[model samples]
Each structure stands twice: as structure tokens, then as C-alpha cells.
Target: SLWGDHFLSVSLDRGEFDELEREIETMKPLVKDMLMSSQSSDKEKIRLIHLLVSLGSSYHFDKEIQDILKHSFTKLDDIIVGEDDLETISIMFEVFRLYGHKMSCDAFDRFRGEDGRFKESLAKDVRGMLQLFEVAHLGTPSEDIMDEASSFAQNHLDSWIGGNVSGATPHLLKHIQNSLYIPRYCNIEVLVAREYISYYEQEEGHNKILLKFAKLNFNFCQFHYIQELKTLTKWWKDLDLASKLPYIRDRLVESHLGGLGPYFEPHYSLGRIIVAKIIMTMVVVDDTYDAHATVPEVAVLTECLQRLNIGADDKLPDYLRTVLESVFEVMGEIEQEMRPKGRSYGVKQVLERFKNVAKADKQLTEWARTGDVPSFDEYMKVGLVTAGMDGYAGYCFIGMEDVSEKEAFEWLSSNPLIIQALNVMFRLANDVGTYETEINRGEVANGLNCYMKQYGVTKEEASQELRKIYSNNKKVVMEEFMNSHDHVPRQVLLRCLNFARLFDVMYTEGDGYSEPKGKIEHFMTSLYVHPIPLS
Candidate 1:
């Protein structure tokens, strides 16, 4: 309405008001409306938000834009509220950023504030922008990003969006359902083709974010695909021998049950993509100095792969089955050739490690079933072993000590990374019934050999290096925090650091190894190198 009024000619004959006054006048009302409408229709409110942002961005009105973005993003601070879908929300935000990239920093500055929301008070906005910009550096062709996006939409959005239509929030459902989201995979491909190839001129930060985002999309795609495969596992039991569900059977026999997708809503692709990231991280960290893995490390890798294989199911669709089976076959062949050559001097130690891991997995499962997160000591123990070996929880598994059991479960439901890692391995153990593949022929063995062959480093060296860095980083981070004399935001930065470490050490490419092609490969690879015991 104000914009419409502004469209009219305003002569100096009346009273000449500065642009800031005009802009803030336009903004303050919208900001109030947006905040007030929190209880109203979220979609419409956000749409208005979209318009406000577009106008603010278009006109290079910096202050209004920063105020709105800060208000909107901060209102949902420190906790993820129940969204219709966070995945979609993230995509929406990304879309907005992409659309408004043509705006100058002056425009960005107008909207910016030192909220310290990202926890770096000294330079929070700058740091976040820098980090975000880094993500853009990894961008790839939009077509590739679109393929993964389509896969994610198919698996996550379609089912839930339908629920929105059927539920009480029909109008709300209609608002989101009728957006620019691509439907047909083919159409997605074409659209991405138009967008991706043309992005070659994008800034480095844009490219990084694009690459990371595309990979993220792929992770979701693989996750949903795996979920379907696991769902089919329900149909496997008690089926008549002659009755064949070729789709499922194919997935199980081939070991493509989960592929390289995450098991979470938006970010995680079941450690598949993360593992690839970890490998890359390792390579960069080690500077290709560590490759030939030690015997113990080999055992860890072996176990990791074994756990991944255990996730396969006979009910997987034939198409998916072929996808997974290839992975299993490769692991099997690799394992067969490895066990005989490497001497098992640390056999007893390895077995003990396995026992500990089994126990940790049991404890986590019990916690899941009974709704109890173990004590900090237990968390510490689990984390110590799991950090290098399994997933990032056990260590990052904080905030549960004071919460109730139900609260703990709820927290875990939202934060399921560590729990999933523990459960996934157990699931694998339960699946590989009576397959008498020797240690070398098993999933674990193959990974051990692969890690050793590829990285050319021993477990001892990796451990020594990891410990040195981990402890040094901790001290440096702590001292840095103390010098600043801030706590709340510092802790958040520490948490971010922890997250980055997990991504670097466990997910990115390590040594000379390329990132795994899929999730199963990641699990297999993780099993091959991570510790056999829990913390």
C-alpha cells in the first residue's frame, strides 16, 4: 500500500523527506505485520515476506532488508519450530538469496545487523556471509543440482504435501502446493540445464554453496530411496518362495538398500555424502601424508562396511537392488583378496573393540526404546570411540542430561545422527544371517584393505595425528573464547566447530580416496576406518 502511495509523484513543493524516512516508514509496518502474523497463516505471511524482501532488494534499500531478514531468521532462534517442512524452507531461503544476488552490498548492509546469531559476535554477519559464500564456491551445474532436488521432492515433499491437502490446513496447503516447485523429473532436468550451465559466471562463493546444496539435494534423494527400500524389507518375511517381489529382491541381493543418501529430513544423507566429505577433509588435513592404514584402523573400516551391508533387505525393488548389489559385490571381491595377506597380530584387541561397539550399540538402542540418554560419562565413552569410528554423536550428544525421558526422545527425534549410526549397524548385524564370509570377505575386511591401500597410512599414525589436532583445536578454541569473555555465543561457535570437525574427519574425502559414489559405500568405508569400540 505504501509502495503504491510512493508511486505517486511527491514534489519538493510539499515537504522533502529523505529516502531513509520513506524506506523505514514502508518497512516498520511490514515488519510488525510479519511478526504479528506468526499465529496467522505462515505461508501467506512468508509470501508477503517474499514480496517485502524482493522490493527491499530491488530498490537497494539496505536497512529495511537487514531488519526484516534478521527479524524473520531470529524469531525462530536456537530451536527449529515445527515447520510444514524444513527442507522446503531451506530451499525457499536459498531461492530468495539466489534471486536477490544482483543487489549490491549496500543493499545487503541495509538489512544487516550484528545479531551474533551465528555466534561470532566479533564479526558474526561477516563470518556467516563468508561461510555462506564458501558454500557457493562448490556449486556445480544446476542440472545436476536439479536431479537431486527432484529426487528429494519425490521422496520427502510429495507424501507430506498430500497430507497438507487432506488435513485441516487446506488453504495453507494450497499456498505451498501451488509454488514454482518443479514436478516432473524431466522438467526439472531441463530447468536445471537452463540454470546450471548459465551459472558458470557465478562468484566463487555462489559456486560453493551451489555444489554443497546440490550434494545436499542428492543426499535427500538417496535417503528417500533407501527409506523405500527399508520399507519393502517389511514385506520380505513370510513371502512364498515362488512369489517374487523382484523390485525388493533386486535391492537386497545387490546391497543397494540405502545407497548414499541421508536418513534425516534435509541435511544428512545417511553419512554417505558426509563420508565423501570426510575423505576430502582427510586428504586436505593429511596433505596426502597418511594413506597406508594400520591393522587396527583396518579392523575399524571392516566393521563399518559390515554394518553398511547389514542394512540391505530382500524386499528392495529390482531396479534399486541392482544399484546396491554392485556395492556389495565390490566389497566382497575386495575383502576376499585382503584378509589372507594382512597378518592379524592384533586379533584379540580387535575382538575386544568389536565387543565394546556391540555393547554401545545395544545401549543406544535401549535408550531409543526406553527413552533414556546415558550420562555424560557414558556419552564421553561412546563419543571417544565413535568420533573416529562411527557417527558424530556420543560427543555432540549434549543437552540430554537435564531433559525428561520423553523430552530426550523428542530431542533425539530431532537430533538422530548418533542414534541412527548406532541403530544402523545393529540393523546390519541382524540382516546378514548365516553368511559365513570370513573377516576378509566380509564388509569390514574389504573397507580395511581399501583404506590401507588408498590412504597408505597406519591407524596409529591417524590416531596420533587426530588426537594432536583435536586437543590443540580444543585448547585454541577455549583460549580464544576466554579472551573474548563471552559464553553463550562462544558455545555456539564451538558447536559449529564440532560440526565442522565431524564433517571434515568423517564425511569428506580423506587420503587419496575419492568420495564414495553412494551412501552404502560411505557406511562401508566408515566401518573400514573408524574405531571398533564406542567411546
Candidate 2:
């Protein structure tokens, strides 16, 4: 109950925050001039850009970063690298991909031998191996070379972690350990940048100006995030959901943290607020369906949601009525806010996502009542929708522009490939992490049980196979994302990508959303509670 009375109470020094903001404004021009200076070496410019991104400051200079990368792409052939210098090549590849520019996977061909294996000597360069390990996670299914490179890099990195640790710095060692568990493709960017800044500070020759700006920038954002959290905290308290829905997880802070995972820019302030509310609502509905409501009660609840008519709540139980009332009230609030913004249609689609989630939940109840475990394929069809991805994506457009168009809604309702890929990974990862607990509780049948029953395998063997499925689903995610630009707007598509990344951090070790004690707690503190030291 450490956070019982007050959810998040972090006071900011307004004077200090404004002073730091002004100082960073003053520094941006000098940094831009340095990048444009003729005396600045190509390596220095590239290194600076990479550092800016790693420190989470690249969003401030989006146009400049893109221009530099475009300029670099023109001379990609001329860039020099030693055969063992995988770090340089990997960074170049990562920057290109991150900025929506494609880099050739063949860049690693030089390091390969006649047998198609990386040179044995490559393993000795732990830094280079680590970079390549990260780079491998960004590859799509089409990149056969990268598929091979991933296996090679992972094997070598695992070897380093197994032995030969003395030469590595504490920061490097920590990164290696983290990277082993959570790949770069799957990390929350803001959290990654926060940790990177600490790691950079430990470097012997880190750029003092860049490091200072990064710390200042993080605190400035943290100050704003705290303000946002205060607003959300007040709203949640007023709703009094805790007393009404005592079974639901009191995760107001955690819900807001979920929105920050995908979009953390200053301009996305309203979007973040709306997304936090959306996630909070989704979790409550999920808890009711999964843990609280009985078969007949949930059936009535499901029907009530599909009809979505006012006054129907009179027939439901007190708790179900309260849940339905809150959901509709939130939906009305969203419509009222978005109507003025000319995004009224997005609200309609959001309501549909909720109904769809209810339908999926109803199916699970039927299975549980009948004591029938669905086949793996049959389970996935309903399970993905139950995961609340459609609702997540629909709500993401609440504050966005062109992507909220009629075509976008149609595309989203179709359950496009990218979202399906994302849903597969999200559900599978959660099932793997939470299967035993759910089974022990005799709750709903999870993907683990279905996979085991379907394949006639032991729980351990089923879990190993599920991990392979998750990895392949990640490939589908990357491939579908690369191909989605032609069908869906990039901004809309990014929500799915971010959701996949969120799962990586959230479900990597355990059910981070359900149990947010250790790693998730640390992320929340670093992101909003703990302000970086100005000095």
C-alpha cells in the first residue's frame, strides 16, 4: 500500500525544468551546426546521430536526422569498415531501418566465410557481437541472410555470457544480460534510452554536451508526464472504480505507462491521455470477463454489450450494471471530445471493438462450461480478438489525423496482417508467461493447454514449441509491417509495431501487466517518478 493514498506524487521544480528546457533550446543550434560543419568527420556525424537516438533526443531533430541519413545513404558504398567491425555496420543498418529507410542485409556478407558461418574471430569482439545481436532482431522474414546472421550472433553472444566476462564494463555486461532477454526490436524506446544514458555516462569519452541534453530532455518530459499522471489519477479516483470493481487490478499508473510505450512525444500529450484511459477501461473489462463474472452472468453481459442500448442495464446484476455503465459513460465522453475534433467515427469503431471483445469472452465461457479445450488454430482465431488488440488500435487513433479516416477504419476492421501478427505474438507471449497460474486457478483454457492437447506434448515441450511460434510470429510482424505502408498509413501502422514492442518488455520474463512488481515498477519510476540529476 506504499502508493495507496496517492498514486504518483512527484513534485517538479518549475524553475529548474524551464531552465533546462531553455538550455536545451540553446544547445540544439550548436549541435546542428556541429553536424553541418565541414570539419566534422563522417564517423563523428554518424556517431552523434546514433548517440542522439540512443539518448531519446532524435525526435527533436527528426528532419535533420532524416536529411543526414538520406545524405549517408547516397555514400553508403564509400563507408569503410574492418571485417571485424560489426558494431559500425550494425549501427548503420539500425539507423537506416529505424528511420524507415531500408538497408541491405548483405552488409554482413563480408564477415561470412566460405562455409556461410561468421568468422570464428568475430566472437572475441563482444561489443561487435552484441550490436549484431541487436541488429538481427530487426530483420524481416525475407532477409534470409539476416536469419542466418541472427542465429550466428545469438550463439556467439550466448557464449560470451556463458564465460569470458572479465574484460567487459559493468554497463556493457548489464546491457548484454538485458539484450539476451529482451531484443532491441522488442524494447520500449523511452526505457531503452533511459538505460542507455546511464550506460553512456559510464563511458570514458562520452559527449558531455549530448549527455547533459539527454538528461535535461528526459526530466523535462518527465515533468510533463507527471502532470499528465496527476490528471489521470484524479479522474480514476473520481470514477471510484476501485470500490466498485474490487477484483480488477488497481493499475491506473500502469495503464498510463502502457500508452507511453507507443507514443511519448510532446505533441502526443492528448493521445497519451486518451490511450491511458482506454487501456484502463480495457483491463477492467478483461478482469470482469476472466476472473469475476459467471457463465450465465457473462452471457447476459455479452448480449447487453452487443445491443449497447441504454436502459438494458436494468436487467443485469449490480456489478455487471456498474461495469456496463462505466463503459458507456467512457464511450460517451470519448465521443463528446472527439466530435469537436472531427473524429466522431473513431469513437463508433472503438465501441465495436468492445463488443467484439465481449463476443470473444463469451466464447471462452462456453468452452469453460463445456470443459472443452479448443484446438490451437481454433483458439487463436478467438483468442487474438480477446487480447483487445482491435480496441487498442482503434483507440490509438483518437488523437491522430489522416490515419483516422474512413478507409483506415475499414482497413482496421478487416483485421489486417500486421495487427493479426501482433495479436499472435501478444497472446502467445502472455499465455506462455501466465499459463501455469491460469491452469492452477482453473480459469480459462490458455494457448499453452490448447497447444499441449492439440499436439499431444508435455507442458515443457509445448512451451518450447510455443516459443518457436512466437519467434516466427515476430517475423510475420516485421514482414507485414514492411508491406503495410502500401495499405495503411505509417502512423496507424506504428501502433501495432509499438504494441509488439510493448509485449517484448511486458511479457518477456513474466506477466508484466498482471504483476507489475519488479521490472515494470522500475520502468514506471525511471520514466515518471525519478527525475534525472541536472549536473
Candidate 3:
């Protein structure tokens, strides 16, 4: 009940919301017509597409965007033959690769100099260099040329950043700063859009219709997010797990933020709520094992979950029953909601992963209690599940009407290479970021401890080694996107990718999920607290 009376008391004005949607409805097709316009040049269409994405309104015109990209992919060679626009080409590469186009990295070969490097002259175009830097992030680890592109773009960009003078206006400088800090491929989409809206507003000759549409969409979504948060608050308040389990972290808001990372579209409200509740439940479950229960109690609790026994005698503590009941309630509700829609098949898939995570948490508890530091690889076997990427990914899918088919659930449950890599990256990124916090908390069994223990290296070396692996695995994810198993839809792949991006955004700056007050507060405030000014 800590947040019972706060924030949720406010209500969205339906009239205002409806008005905003009407304006958005009117604008959506005008923009689509611009995209479908035969008179619009290829580069113009590409720029509009980029603007659509940058403004975070691309979801509104999904079919048109794809149709154009699909046909444009066929004519890419001819389209770029006589053209030498770096910014346009870079955006095209990103757009194509993101849509599962397998747009070859070789498309940039013309931009390379005779020395087999990106020509130095290319760096003069700041926006082009900036986007090319972003495109390289989508490149695979084995692509030597991408490494060169990354370095080439980064070196020039670094000088501009350090000197703080490129003859670029303030808005252009802000845009460059935003991407340099976190490449677009890895940045949270919602936050990227929010920041870009402000940046674009300041740009010279920015498109008014697109900017207004972006602003309207951003505000409408913000209102939707508040309503979603309110829905979650009511559920959490009724459950009142905070009062029952005083030992657990009260993170309903943070967990809601966790759900927002996977998706920001309003239609995914059901998915957001489902993921938020799961996140809240998982936080409590994790705390119970990590900080509260003894080995015997946790072992039995794990058994309780594994057995699906809701009714247990006094052998378990009252709080244990309380937590177990919450778990059951969440799983049951998932089925209740999805089953009627004929999408309930994915519910059990999510359950298995949840069980795996709980079981893994118990295993980690045993390791810590018994003073065992397994080897790095040995730990990842359990570490991946314990991190909950698999389970969270499943929950994200359960909210969908489109791609959350039973077979998609099976595909995710099978733990494809990309899923495994994503789990590894999230686990290590977490380990690296929280190394100091956990070690200082006098805790053992973090990834760093295992790495250092196995290799007999300094903490510094262990941290860097884990990070290198983490960075490499992100490329692994991109490669998977380029060429995933045939049945996996791009929407499913995006959810998986967004999970990684969300984790990095939160974890890269010191356990934003756990702590969430300092740096993470900035993102949270921009996301939900203050509404964007509409002109």
C-alpha cells in the first residue's frame, strides 16, 4: 500500500484522449500517402521513413513502411548507383536490416577508399557519419569491414565531440550526442523517440506535420502508460504483497518500467500489464530466495511451485504460502485471459520458463549457502535461467494477438541460439554492472567472482573479459535477426531485441531495476512524469 494513494488517483480525460486520437487518425494516412507517392524521390521516401521512426510514429504506418521497403530492397542497387548520399544510404541499411531484409553490409563498399577503409572524406558529413556509426552496431562480429566502419565513424565523431565545435547548430550537436552516448540499435525505443522529439523540434526546417504527429502520439501513449500503471497499481494494492512480505523490494513502478521496455505501443497494453505483474512477482520470488528463506524452507518452496500445490499445511511459513499463492494467481490469470482468445497455448510455455527461473534461483541460493563458485561456463548454465530472460520473453509474447502463436511459444521455449546469447549478455551485463554492489554487499557467486576464481585474474581483468563476451553476443543477436529460423516472425525478434536493449539501459548504469532512483530516474521522468508540450 506504499503507493496506494499516490499517482494512481489521477485520471485521463476521455475527451482529450479521443480528440488526440482523432487528430492522429486524420494525420496517419496523409503520411502514408506521402510514403506511397510515386512522385516522391527514393531518398525522400527513405528520409520520411527515418523521420517516422525517429519520431516514434512508425508503428502507425507499419504496412506501408514494409511494402515500400520490400520493393525498395529489390531496386537498392539501381537506387544507389548514381546517388552518393551517405545519410540516406545509412538509414536505408538500418531500415532494411531491422525489417529482416538481409540487406548486405557490402552495400557500403562504394564508400570505401582504395586502401580498404571508409574514405576519410566521408566523415565530413556529420549526420551521415553518425548514422553509419549506428549501422555498424547492427553488423555482425565476424564482419571485419564493419569493425572498420565503426572505428572510422567513431574516431571522427569523437573529435567533434571532444572539440565541441563542428559548425553544427545546437540541435545537430544534441542529436549527435544522443546517438554517441548509446547507439540507436541498442537504445530503448521509447526513450529514443522522446529525446528525438525534443531534438527535432529544435532542428532547422523540421517537418511540422510529422513533428505534430510525433508529439500527439507521444502524449497519447504517455496517457495510456499512466492508465496502465494505474491498472497495475490497483492489482498490486489489492494483493498487498508489500505489507505481507516486508522483506521484498517494493518495486511495482520499476517492474512496470520493465514491461515498458519490451513495448511502447498502446495496443500492447495487455502485454505490458502481463509482463509488469510477472516482473513484480519475480522480484518478490528472487528476494525470498536471496535474502529471506533458509535452504530447507527455499528447497521446500521450490518443491511447492514445482508440484503446483496451492494448498500446503503449516510446514511452510505463512509468507511462503502468500508468495506461492501470488505465483499461482499470476499463472492462472494469464490462462484465464489468454484461453478465451484461443491464445492460451503460450501460457504454459511461459510457466515452464518461470519454473526454470525459480528452480535456478534456488540452485543459486544453494551455491551461495554452500560456498561453491562454479566455473564461468558452468555458472551460465544456471545463470541464464536465473536472470529470467527466457521467462520474460515468454511473458512478452503472451500479450500478442498477432505473433504469439503456440508454435512461436515452442520456438522460444526451445531456446534458439539468439535467445541463449541474449540470456548470456543480460546475465554478464548485470554481473559487470552490479559487481561492485554485490561484492560490497558481502555476497559471493556473482559472475565476476566465478570468472576471477576460475581464471585467477584481477577483478578488472574479469570485468573486461565478461564485457567483451557481452559485446560479442550482441552481434550474435544481430546476426540472428539477419537470418533467423524461417518461422520466427520479426515482431517476436524485436521483443527479444528490446529485452536486451531494456536490460542494458537499466543495468549499464548500476542496477537501475534494483535501485532505479538516480540516473534511471531521468529516463522514467521523461517517459511518464512530464507530458510533452503541444503547440
Q: Report lDDT per candidate.
A: 0.30, 0.76, 0.79
What ranges in model 3 sit over 4 Å off? Answer: 1-5, 440-442, 509-517
Better of 1 and 2 by TM-score: 2
Please, what are the lDDT tens digits per residue for candidate 3 over residues 1-535?
Answer: 4543565797779998899889999998788888889899876887788888888899998888888888888988888886688887889888888777877777788788888888888867888899899888787778767778888898898888777566547778777877777677667888889989998999879889999999999998888888888888888887777787767666766788778888999899888898888778767777777633687788888887677776567467788888888877877887888898876777766656677777888888877777778888788888888876767777788788888476676786587888888888888877767666766644578788899999999887887787778778888888886688345887888887787787667666421223233446667667776789899
For this target, which candidate reaches the highest TM-score against the unseen true structure? Answer: 3
Model 1, 1-535: lDDT tens digits are: 1111221222222122243235434545544544356475544444444433322221223344444444454453222334323223443343233322211112222222465122222132222232222222112222133223333333333455555433654543342242223211111111222223223223344333233333333233333434433432332232221143221212231222122211222122223222322222222211111123233333443343335443334232342233234434433433343335331221112223244443444333344334343443344454334333322222121221222323333433353343333332222221122113312222222222223334565643433333333333433332332233222232222232233222222222222112212322433322222211111
The estimated TM-scores of all candidates read: 0.21, 0.91, 0.94
Give the residue spans of candidate 1 off by over 4 A.
1-107, 112-257, 262-334, 337-356, 362-377, 383-535
RMSD for each of the candidates = 24.5, 2.9, 2.4
Q: Which residue window of length 10 is worst by lDDT in model 3? A: 510-519
lDDT of 1: 0.30
lDDT of 3: 0.79
